[PDB]
Amino acid sequence: SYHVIRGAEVSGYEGKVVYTYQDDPEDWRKAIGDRLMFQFGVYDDPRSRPPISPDESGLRYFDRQMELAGYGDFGPVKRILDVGCGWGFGLKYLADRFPACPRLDGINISARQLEYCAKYHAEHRLSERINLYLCNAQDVDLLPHADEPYDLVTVRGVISHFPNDLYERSMAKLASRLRPGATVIISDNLYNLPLEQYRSDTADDVDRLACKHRKTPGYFRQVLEQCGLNVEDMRVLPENIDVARWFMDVKKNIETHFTPDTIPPPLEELRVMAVNVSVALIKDQFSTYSVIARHP
């Protein structure tokens, strides 16, 4: 079960995102791993015993981001928000990491992901601690209990799906729900060239995985600052060769567990996207960034 939140002004891009994440979570598990973590991974953790799966590299990327955010006396954490909560591992990970945090909220516009989130959280006995909302990032102001501000927010691989307009409005409303000194942990995928210069290695005529709203490091950071957040740390993470590795391991998973008949269309987009983006990553035209931001 999830609660519904509508802001009477619906984003026209929702349909494209819903389509992307519609399909059987068991097919996604075969592509990206059992944890269903969908924002890359690091292959440099001394704890990782090769071969390193997308489950291991994803987990260790999150650990590294938690370290950079200073959660290795981290201050009060009584309420957590996961923006675009995917298939719910992010909320489970934070729940286990913050056992004295009684409230974690997840927002998502994919009903199929939220259906899987509830069943998955229930199996791990977190249903009371974790609340799920069918809620666009731009209606975060409508989330219940504005009298209880968020201490920690994750936005990992979500801003890639935002039009510039949506991104600016969402971050302004997110900022308004933060306690002073609250941390925002961001992962996203940004183009290191001017947008006019960049040319897709493999022509994208179908908008692969609803990621057409490309952004630069400069603009990305400008928006966080304009909403009154302080950028504490911004860096390439994972490294280009690690994002490429994740992509190509996921491509291999898809080509090894599916045929062109049975493959769900979004996993076909991901299979093609893997070579295109990996080439762009090798050429340093594209990087995944870790951003730690705080409310002053």
Ligand SMILES: Nc1ncnc2c1ncn2[C@@H]1O[C@H](CSCC[C@H](N)C(=O)O)[C@@H](O)[C@H]1O
């Ligand atoms: N405008 C929007 N508002 C809320 N959620 C959105 C959104 N656009 C995309 N999303 C969600 O953002 C997620 C992108 S994939 C990332 C999932 C998760 N952060 C992980 O690390 O695995 C999906 O759950 C998608 O449905």
Ligand SMILES: CC(C)=CCC/C(C)=C/CC/C(C)=C/COP(=O)(O)OP(=O)(O)O
């Ligand atoms: C969606 C998301 C951010 C979640 C995390 C996992 C993931 C697969 C990231 C996608 C990164 C991205 C912007 C791909 C663009 O490829 P493309 O083939 O669309 O590139 P192009 O069309 O710009 O050449």
Ligand SMILES: [Mg+2]
């Ligand atoms: Mg694209």
